[PDB]
């Protein structure tokens, strides 16, 4: 067990690397989700506006 625990500290920096990588991956996943959501909002917003313009021109006609 001396061996096991001596090298647990030797591979603790690798543990930190693994941790940070996983956390960053999850954070980027959430960022992607939020990016998609904002883009969806923009797509929808444009449909709403385009209609309110087909109806605006319809009023003119």
- What's the Rg (C-alpha) of the chain? 26
DSSP, res 36? H
Alpha carbons 38 and 45: distance in angstroms, whole number: 10
Experimental method: cryo-EM
Q: What is the resolution of this structure in A?
A: 3.2
Alpha carbons 40 and 55: distance in angstroms, whole number: 23
Measure CA of the first residue to CA of the last residue in the chain; give whole Å: 87
């Amino acid at each position: 067990v001396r061996a096991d625990l001596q090298a647990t500290a030797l591979l603790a920096s690798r543990g930190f690397a693994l941790y940070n990588a996983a956390n960053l991956k999850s954070i980027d996943f959430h960022r992607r989700i939020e990016e998609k959501s904002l883009a969806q909002l923009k797509r929808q917003m444009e449909r709403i506006r385009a209609k309110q313009e087909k109806h605006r021109q319809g009023r003119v006609d």
